[model samples]
Target: SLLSLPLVGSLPFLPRHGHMHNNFFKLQKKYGPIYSVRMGTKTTVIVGHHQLAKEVLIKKGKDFSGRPQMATLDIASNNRKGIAFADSGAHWQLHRRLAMATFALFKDGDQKLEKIICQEISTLCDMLATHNGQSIDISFPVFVAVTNVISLICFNTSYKNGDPELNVIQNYNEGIIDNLSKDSLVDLVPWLKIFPNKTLEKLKSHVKIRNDLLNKILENYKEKFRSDSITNMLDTLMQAKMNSDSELLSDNHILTTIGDIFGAGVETTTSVVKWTLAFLLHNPQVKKKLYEEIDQNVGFSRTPTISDRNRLLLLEATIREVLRLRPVAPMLIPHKANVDSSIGEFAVDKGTEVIINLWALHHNEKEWHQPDQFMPERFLNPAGTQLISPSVSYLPFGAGPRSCIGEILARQELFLIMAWLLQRFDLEVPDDGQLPSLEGIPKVVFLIDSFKVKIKVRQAWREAQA
Candidate 1:
């Protein structure tokens, strides 16, 4: 009878009403660390306890590695590529290997690519300069800058400010974000994927547009496959061979792999940069301290280099604080249980879906002091002498074998971009009498959508420096 409660077994009556973002902490308090929530026919177990998360996601990671097959991803991703949405299989393995190999090429401690980052920073500076001392919505510019970095890395090209291609990419990316929040009948009723609706139809169109753009980029890479030109990730993927006989990656897989890098890579990074800037604006003392560190350690004559990351400890602390306050992917990609398992004493059934509540874990009173405050100094020592531990309770990039492949690269990008922006201009809320709120809600697509910040350049300081 308990199992037979109204809307207990059926997927259609779940209502899709609760806000996962705002209620994650409350739910943890009410339901204990591990409790089940029914979304349609799927039962997802949200794990709020860090110890249980470690046991399931880290210690028993291999068994709980599969991703749920969502209708939007299935249609948009062609059921073929992308490491994030791919079902645990040979295809996933092949794509992951290629991604790893591609990332490895960029990690040789080379400084040649620093110029590329500088160019991007310069372009962004120019944009901000044009909007000097005026209130401008920064989300679009930040998205463009971050996406262009990925574009340059993958395609050996950069989209100019206000380029049509960039606009197209932006449109496609927004569509994906839009789809994430909409009530997906398909996700509720799997069979609706066959019946087709307006949302599904629009999602398909966006996916096709993105896939076509990626295919064109890959085609260009193939056409220009010279020794010198084969330096980007697309070239790397194009040249990668299957490691096993039964694990051949098809053309679709290759294109979709590029799509994954473009979509996932850009969305998270852009949102993060926007959030970090917003945090800096709201906390002027932290921003001023960060600028002092960057100015003293890495001057403005040249942009912040990756090597300077070590010396700029305060900047790194600020980033850690930002991620701790607002992780872009709060609830990490869910993991599925392979068999019956126990975290301490509670038994987790086989096929039970595991949700890692990073938000709740990061803000746990037991783990952090003043967990609700945006305090970068918490990462440092009480005597202000040396660095404490960078891994106390931070899991922004996830953990273990399935950690984000672009973690290092992403860190470098965030550090460099933040450093450059701080050195060039001070960010703040507009005089429109409204400051952006820190709160966010989980959207349907797999990202947080409540990011809208208005900023203006610090003019007197800029002119004084000039």
Candidate 2:
């Protein structure tokens, strides 16, 4: 039976305490793997089990591919104009295909990607080296570096240190992440946006900053466009637009698509990197093993590259474990029912909000042994020779069409950065500092709270340089 309240529908039934995802997980114990609740006027079906999530997200993907009309996301995506928030339609399909094609080009087709990213990693490592042995929060620097990465990939742009514009972008993005995508009250009660609301106000302001920045970049890029070559994502987008019919593409589409790349690209990858760093600090043994693997596979003679990703089984497994343990998007962007459909025995009507509780699936005790522990070895086979997921429960980038578009790029970024960093420095918590708690603060993406680490320059790299 669907849980509902008076006029507020299921608002009262929602766990009032803990992170929203945790609350949902807690409720799952009582309500079982799959259950429905009414959030105001909308019927929301939460899927906790892996197979069921796979079913909805894969088998019935098209039927459940619709993006719901949320107040905040609608505003953010300019009324579902971008990939992540856009409703399933021809325009969405066109852009999604275009984005995928460009990503393919960027990830594999272009030889320059690895070099460009490695250059950024070099700069990042140098920055960290300067602060070596000092306990400092790496979030800001990491965020900026990752932002520059996506910027280069998307707009062919990069910023210098103390660039005021970089701060502006970071500040607004932080605001947007903090305020938006938490299933805000304004979304549940759309009418709440009419009156003064802090969440919506903050989101609007931050979104304006983001939109203004994107617009300025887009306009500047257009002005400088000689159509020389498809250098970056924006170039690909613009080239596609020029080559296609007017009805099929527009400037807004480009803006929204680039916005998605910047928004998702920077934040999600940064979060994963931060989480991995935190986890390594929390488990020093794992860190030691990671260094050993990197040392064995690719010595200090050369920096770790994409090709080394396969040889460094522990590194790959560790990253995968970090993903499994702290999936960036815990619930994933909520999926909507395009048509009346049934997830298993339960019937879901059109417009019903379907949220797959990835947190539950990832931490499900039935699927994992000692699920709460951060053991990268869990991802490795008994021989520990090959990387293997113990179960099908893991969906870090999610599964199927509506899944994360930047998976290839993100994996490469995460793997290369981690491998490179681990090869150079030892990530350790400050002597007096508290080890970062594995419990992540929930948001659009599950964020690792601010923590400082002492990045010690490894003897191998230092001695090799000496």
Candidate 3:
């Protein structure tokens, strides 16, 4: 176990592992599943086991649902104004419901949103086709496609491949994410902010760029806002604010809510799609199986739809495995103990930061066989027809009151995009015979190294279409 001295806690004694989640996971191996360490003024509890994570996040959900105060989160979330980074309270509940209701209008079995998604996917496929078997990076176009869907849903706007505003959004978002590690250090030692900190300065600028863009969008919406016929999420939230008698709902709330959706919605889904493509490149057998699944059920005559998702168990399981292998928010944004709470036998006091090590839970040998390997079949029964979670150790979206609000939308996007791409293209390694690296380099989210793959139209699909 690490030593916890005065003022610094275990900071000086702790071992370094570069990535925060990996560091926590490494610590768990030496210090047991549930361990405590102090950092500056905060007492942080790291929960590595599934049962403890369940107890802290679900059994005593409300008691551990609060978000701890962090300087960087404050800047990004606008002093905890939005759902993702906000403390659990009536405001959070209201905004969460608002976001959920807005998504419900366009998600699940909804035909309208499906149409929008397919339109973007169509354009994306066309763009990929233009590459003509060249090894091209999918990051930019994939991002644009996902952003288009979310932008249209959020504010009835979309962007082209070379759109300048899209470039700005991408750069600034990456800028912010790239600086989060430095920002986290500021949180550990609060007084560091008083000195000349370039990281803090850079982070603030990036956030300002993000907020300015968001503010511009909000102002545009406000000027042309109409409650009678709401076309996007901004309109829906505005209608809610106008219709409600309470003063809790403000323009700031609407801005932050839209920001959360746009940021989380676009970035996370796109990352998963990239990881899926990379993994498919590494494991051609998985790709062949996905092709067979699509060919058998949907065939080449028609495009794969959300209705086909239930029948595409392999694709679903593959997505599940991808998420488990590299959860976007590996530490789950750090939950706070709102009151004196016990995660299993460990009594945690109010305001202690609770970090759930999802990486450990997903990779624990006791829970998963060959945890390091890519095996989508692990999520399926022996017959390989039904999707199942063999253990309660998995929580890619966390759980309880603080679970991801974007879960439904993420699933819908991932399924459709993967299905569409796999159905049309057979992704292969580059001519140099290099497979995309599966090892993730962590930032705000764990992401893989930049790699390209050559994609060819599936011969079977071509023959079927002919």
- Local accuracy by lDDT, each model: 0.70, 0.82, 0.83
TM-score of each: 0.87, 0.93, 0.93
Q: Give the clashing residue pairs of candidate 1, or none.
A: 11-40, 180-444, 180-445, 181-444
Cα lDDT tens digits, model 3, 1-466, are: 9996676233623333366666667767577898877755678888999999898888898899998877777888888988988899877998898888877787444437778888899999989988867888899888989999999888888886688999999999899888765422223445546676787678899988988999998887788886677767887888888787356678777778888889998889989999999888888898888888888999888998988978999999999999998888777878899988788777889898888888889989899999888999999999998998877889999999999988987888999999999888878888987787787776667777889888888787789866
> What would the C-alpha RMSD of candidate 1 be, to one decimal place?
3.9
Indicate the residue-level lDDT of 35 in model 1: 70
The lDDT, on a scale of 0 to 1, for candidate 2 is: 0.82
Stretches of candidate 2 above 4 Å error?
Answer: 1-15, 107-111, 181-196
Candidate ordering by lDDT (highest first) = 3, 2, 1
Clashing pairs in 2: 5-9
User: Judged by lDDT relative to the true structure, which candidate is superior, 1 or 2?
Assistant: 2
Q: Per-residue CA lDDT of candidate 2, range 1-466, in tens?
A: 9986675333634343567666777777777888776645777888999989998999999899988886778778887897988999987888888888877776455446787688788888888899878888888777877888888888778898788987888898888887775532213335554666577777898888889989989998888776877777888888887776556578887888889888888889888988998888878898888878788889988888889877999888998888988888888888989998889868899999899989899999999999888988988888889988698888988887798888888888999889888889877778786888778877777888888888889888988986
Residue 405's lDDT within candidate 3 is 86
